[PDB]
């Protein structure tokens, strides 16, 4: 399993680059789902089979439904900003690019130079995640409960309607 | 010597079925001749989202429930304990009726 | 490794504030009861530091292989929960005239006082990445708790965007160390490496991203940009626990990284922390001086004291007092701090609504509440290294810890930084007494009152007699 | 080039060709079951007419999701019956996730929903895919817990050591409220009559099926029912004794109770009317999630205390 | 087989993507999917170190990375309804009402 796990790479990497330079955002959610199925391919290449099963059920079955979710929930189409189109021009597009490359060259210059002993077989069921879950990383889950309970009352409060109604036209500043 | 077949056999599966989906839909091509939904819809996506990433700590304690004693139980517990504070403090909020 | 029924000793504060945080949602379900919620809140914060009391009666272990509590956990667990009492009493009255729910405040504060001890005693990568992530995401709800309100909002959008990048910054070098070390654990990060190669370029540049995502948690330079814009949009008992709490959990958790890893002694991620340091202090300093505004004057006055407490932990491995002078210096900067926010809080106390435009506007504050200005100029005078405050023994401790290991440059920029910081701290000062040109009896105000009155009474206190507070900082000693 | 190693690849590849084809033909076969039981040639005839009809793309839309959409709505709940075992020796599947790829593609079911809806340029089929998906979401939040009730009783995903585990007694009975909770999951997921179409409380919505014409309403029209064959196949093979039987074939035994469910599923489609929308979701989020949760506790104290 | 320099390289390269859509483009719900581009090359290169030394705890930390882009894409994704509903547009430099 390389073969599998190169082309899966690749197209991870070309979905995500078709992501990054888009124009309309539903189009380039799907690229980003087609890209966690990659990179979940890429987990299972690797042995790490709860990794990938995870990615197409937590962050490519929970989360990118969120954002298509708010998608198609306020009706956006990139409305007002495709006709301005200023990520396809060229003075933007340089610099950060160029910059963020740069980034690229010094950190897999920082890649090399480590010792090459493979990725190995064995793969990592759920029952050794398990183990090692209620063992010595007990803490980790409890508070992180804690966590997801946080972000749950964070992003309750700050985005409930506050009005009633199961469809609503635009005010502003909500009347 | 198995696997690999089983493999295989998956692959020749996923293949055929996008494979017949495909031909069947060029087959059926072939011949012939401003406004905003809601919040509370968000808000139930959100619920479940956090509640299937709880629920992902159940999926990874169902696989070692018993390579772990009674102290991983405990632990589950507390943490389905807080998993239900949150459901019941949902409830009684009144932030999970719909009431259309 | 199992946990014994004598490790649930050590466990006790945070378990205390867990079963607080269910105990506050419980009766927010219930009841939805601000009054309740609150003494509920501080009842279990009391309860915790108790529970620390109790630890500190018990012996300093290795819980699991997450945590590791001792005394120097013990003393960063203390600072984060008075921190966060602080807050909660801070924003009672300033909640007290909010128009919707206001018990999630209680709610997060209480969950991100529990990030600030998971932070405190972080013995583990892991722990470290699951305690600053607890601290941050609380804190989105707390920043935008007036999300009414514009500037609440940019601001949490800005908090929320900016910890999400250097969230994802951390965790990028934290797999680049476990990929070049097979050990999550901090005492475990260089161990396989030795004769010279501990200066390795992937543990290099995973340790560069954490220090990326650690100096936006700790407001360094060139990461230091959301500082103002969120200390000015989140309400003023926020702006207190993101200015005290998280950034001493997260200092904390960095010099406990910083000591127990053998990275230590690296001669580049040192020089990298001296420029960081340097640059923080200079450009804090200066961007601090052309400020109208309170609340970005103080944040790049937290700036400057992060500034502070980095050059405090360059000399960590040589001047053998850098643990006992972050650990005097964070408290002298967290009652500072904690009264000049305080101040903010009670005079910007209640919300008044989000139409209104919440400026301070500090002058002629002492001619209708002396005792506030009183305790303003306190602080004032204790955030620029002047004697008679605390914040002076704080300074004259880094500046010790700078000139013990020859850090010249470092101790230069030091006192060109004070020199300049004393300006706009005397600056305000002044204006807090100087003429207005144009211009309360419930409980919890007078709470508020006897809270930031006794933090001046502290600071007095410990400028003019330091001792118990440098007996109490030895007693709390890491397990080397 | 000929050699028994080759044969035997060939006969795995044979053994999944034809499981697709008896699962595909056994969906469109019991489609017009149900429609009898509300002439095996009639489907024929219809899919020589859904053939010979153009497929309408319409103007306003795009050419990619609207069609991808029905691709969603085949493939993702056919290759979750590729998990499901009918034999020790006629099976296409034995890799370790044999319960979370069910979920994988139980997770990705709802992107079919959401994408036509958008695909529609109509604003009520929006609202319509949104209340679909919202409960479908509402619901394959706790189908993950319903599983593992039975996964946390049989030790691993695998469905060889679910069947296996199923020796002495099978999971129906200790785990009772674990078989409804999957139950009404799977009703609710798959668009099943209760829970279905809850456009009932606003004219303001409309269905995702509308502006879908030709194949790409066929898509649909045989996907959803592989989609409750394939959940009729994961019930038995968890819940039942999976090709468990005292004298009968295995895979006689297995078509005689995947046969029985889904004319329980016929009973189903006769007998219960169909709930208001917010009591659905009431019901989904205040009964089943708390029930399968204490659920769970329970079974872990059952398997920890008999564990001698 | 796989050396590790391989996929930490597509790792780093999709954090490098992620960063540059992060940077480059206006629109906030864009910028929420590059975080979440760069949330997911983290938790790639996490679970590639995990799977290099044969230790359990890069797929811990695979779950900690994915708690966490849950939780964050539902601050987000609230704070970016707040914004629609109030501001009535996602323009980033359009909310830059604090100067220095």
């Known amino acids: 399993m390389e073969f599998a796990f190169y082309i899966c790479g690749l197209i991870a990497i070309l979905a ?8 309309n955002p539903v189009h380039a959610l799907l690229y980003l789902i087609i890209s966690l199925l990659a990179i979940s391919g890429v987990f299972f290449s690797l042995g790490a089979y709860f990794a990938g099963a995870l990615e197409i059920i937590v962050y490519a079955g929970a989360i990118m439904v969120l954002f298509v979710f708010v998608v198609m929930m306020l009706n956006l189409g990139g409305s007002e900003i495709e006709q301005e189109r200023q990520w396809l021009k060229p003075q933007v597009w340089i610099g950060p690019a160029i910059l963020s490359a740069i980034m690229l060259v010094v950190i897999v210059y920082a890649i090399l130079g480590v010792n090459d002993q493979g990725i190995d077989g064995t793969p990592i069921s759920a029952k050794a995640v398990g183990i090692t879950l209620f063992g010595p990383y007990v803490l980790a889950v409890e508070l992180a409960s804690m966590l997801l309970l946080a972000g749950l009352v964070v992003a309750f409060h700050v985005g409930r309607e506050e009005r009633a109604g199961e469809v609503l036209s635009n005010r502003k500043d909500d009347s | 010597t198995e696997v690999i077949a089983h493999h295989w056999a998956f692959a020749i599966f996923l293949i055929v079925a996008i494979g017949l989906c495909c031909l069947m839909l060029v087959g059926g091509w072939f011949l012939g001749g401003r406004l905003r939904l809601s919040a509370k819809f968000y808000l139930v996506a959100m619920f479940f989202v956090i509640f299937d990433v709880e629920a992902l700590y159940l999926f990874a304690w169902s696989t070692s429930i018993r390579e772990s004693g009674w102290v991983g139980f405990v ?11 949150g459901l019941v403090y949902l409830v009684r909020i009144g932030a999970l009726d719909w009431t259309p | 490794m199992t946990i014994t029924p004598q490790n649930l000793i050590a466990l006790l504060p945070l378990l205390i504030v867990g079963l607080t945080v269910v105990v506050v949602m419980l009766s927010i379900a219930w009841r939805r009861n601000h009054f309740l919620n609150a003494t509920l809140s501080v009842i279990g914060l009391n309860a915790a530091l108790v529970s620390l009391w109790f630890v500190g009666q018990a012996g300093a272990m290795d819980v699991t292989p997450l945590m590791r509590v001792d005394g120097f956990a013990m003393l960063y667990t203390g600072l984060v929960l008075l921190a966060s009492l602080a807050t909660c009493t801070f924003a009672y009255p300033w909640l007290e005239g909010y128009n919707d729910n206001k018990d999630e405040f209680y709610l997060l504060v209480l969950i991100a006082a529990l990030g600030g001890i998971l932070l405190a005693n972080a013995n583990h990568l892991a722990s470290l990445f699951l305690g600053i992530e607890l601290i941050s995401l609380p804190l989105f709800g707390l920043v935008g708790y007036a999300f009414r309100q ?64 650690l100096g936006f948690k700790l407001s360094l330079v060139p990461f230091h940009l959301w500082t103002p814009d969120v200390y000015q949009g989140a309400p003023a008992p926020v702006s207190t626990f993101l200015a005290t709490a998280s950034k001493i959990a997260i200092f904390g958790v960095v010099m406990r990284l910083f000591l127990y890893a053998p990275v230590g002694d690296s001669e ?8 960081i340091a340097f640059a923080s202090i200079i450009f804090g300093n200066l961007m601090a001086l052309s400020q109208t505004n309170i609340k970005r004057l103080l944040g790049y006055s937290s700036i400057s004291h992060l500034g502070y407490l980095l050059v405090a932990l360059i000399a960590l491995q040589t001047g053998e007092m850098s643990m006992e002078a972050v650990g005097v210096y964070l408290a002298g900067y967290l009652f500072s701090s904690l009264g000049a ?4 809080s009670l005079m910007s106390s209640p919300y008044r609504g989000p139409d209104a435009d919440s400026l301070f506007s500090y002058r002629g504050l002492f001619w209708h509440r002396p005792i506030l200005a009183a305790v303003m100029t306190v602080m004032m005078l204790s955030l620029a290294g002047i004697p008679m405050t605390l914040g002076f023994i704080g300074k004259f401790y880094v500046l010790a810890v700078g000139v013990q290991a020859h850090l010249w440059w470092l101790v230069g920029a030091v006192v060109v930084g004070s020199a300049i910081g004393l300006y706009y701290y005397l600056r305000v000062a002044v204006s807090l007494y100087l003429h207005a ?10 709470a508020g009152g006897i809270v930031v009155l006794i933090s001046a009474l502290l600071v007095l206190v410990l400028g003019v007699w330091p001792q118990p507070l440098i007996s109490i900082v030895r007693l709390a000693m890491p397990l080397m | 080039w000929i050699s028994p190693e080759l044969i035997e690849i060939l006969l795995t590849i044979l053994k999944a060709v034809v499981i697709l084809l008896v699962v595909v033909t056994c969906g469109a076969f019991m489609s017009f079951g149900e429609r009898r039981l509300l002439g095996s040639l009639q489907l024929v005839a219809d899919m020589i007419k859904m053939f010979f009809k153009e497929d309408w793309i319409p103007k306003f839309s795009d050419r990619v999701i609207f069609t991808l959409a029905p691709m969603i709505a085949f493939t993702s709940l056919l290759l979750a019956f590729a998990i499901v075992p009918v034999s020790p020796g006629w099976v296409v599947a034995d890799l370790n996730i044999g319960i979370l790829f069910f979920l994988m593609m139980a997770g ?26 919202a409960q479908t979401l509402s619901y394959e939040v706790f189908l993950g817990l319903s599983l593992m009730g039975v996964v946390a009783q049989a030790g691993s995903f695998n469905m060889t050591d679910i069947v296996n585990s199923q020796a002495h007694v099978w999971n129906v009975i200790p785990q009772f409220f674990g078989f409804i909770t999957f139950a009404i999951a799977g009703v609710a997921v798959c668009h099943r009559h209760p829970f279905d179409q809850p456009e009932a409380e606003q004219e303001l919505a409309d269905g995702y099926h509308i502006e879908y014409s030709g194949m790409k309403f066929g898509l649909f029209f045989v996907g959803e029912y592989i989609g409750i064959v394939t959940i009729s196949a994961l019930m038995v093979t968890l819940f039942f004794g999976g090709w468990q039987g005292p004298l009968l074939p295995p895979f006689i035994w297995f078509a005689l109770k995947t046969a029985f469910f889904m004319m329980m599923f016929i009973l189903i489609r006769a007998s219960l009317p169909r709930p208001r929308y917010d009591q659905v979701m009431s019901f989904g989020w205040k009964i089943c999630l708390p029930l399968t949760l204490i659920n769970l506790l329970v079974t872990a104290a059952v398997i920890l205390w008999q564990a001698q | 087989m796989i050396p590790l320099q391989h996929g930490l390289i597509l790792a780093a390269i999709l954090f490098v993507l992620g960063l540059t859509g992060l940077v480059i483009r206006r629109n906030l719900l864009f910028m929420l999917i590059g975080l979440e581009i760069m949330i997911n090359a983290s938790a790639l290169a996490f679970v590639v170190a995990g799977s290099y030394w044969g230790q359990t705890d890069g797929q811990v930390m695979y779950i900690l990375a994915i708690s966490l882009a849950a939780a964050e894409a539902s601050i987000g994704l609230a704070l970016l309804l707040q914004l629609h509903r109030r501001r009535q547009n996602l323009n ?9």
């Open chain 3, 341 to 344: 926010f305080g101040v903010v």
């Open chain 5, 92 to 100: 980033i430099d359009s909310v830059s009402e604090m100067r220095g």
């Open chain 3, 268 to 275: 580049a991620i040192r020089v990298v922390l001296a420029i």
């Open chain 1, 16 to 23: 995500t680059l078709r992501v990054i330079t888009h124009t």
């Open chain 2, 75 to 85: 632990e589950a517990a507390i943490f389905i304990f807080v998993l239900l504070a």
């Open chain 4, 108 to 133: 990705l079911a709802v992107y079919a929903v959401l994408f036509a809806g958008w695909s529609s340029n109509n604003k009520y089929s929006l609202l319509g895919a949104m209340r679909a998906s």
């Open chain 3, 150 to 213: 514009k500037r609440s909002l940019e601001a949490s959008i800005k908090y929320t965007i900016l910890s999400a990048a250097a969230s994802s910054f951390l965790l990028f070098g934290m797999a680049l160390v476990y990929a070049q070390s097979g050990d999550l654990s901090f005492v475990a990060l260089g161990k396989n490496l030795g004769d010279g190669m501990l200066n390795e370029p992937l543990l290099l540049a995973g340790f560069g991203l954490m220090i990326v995502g």
């Open chain 3, 437 to 446: 040109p144009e211009q309360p009896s419930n409980w919890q105000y007078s």
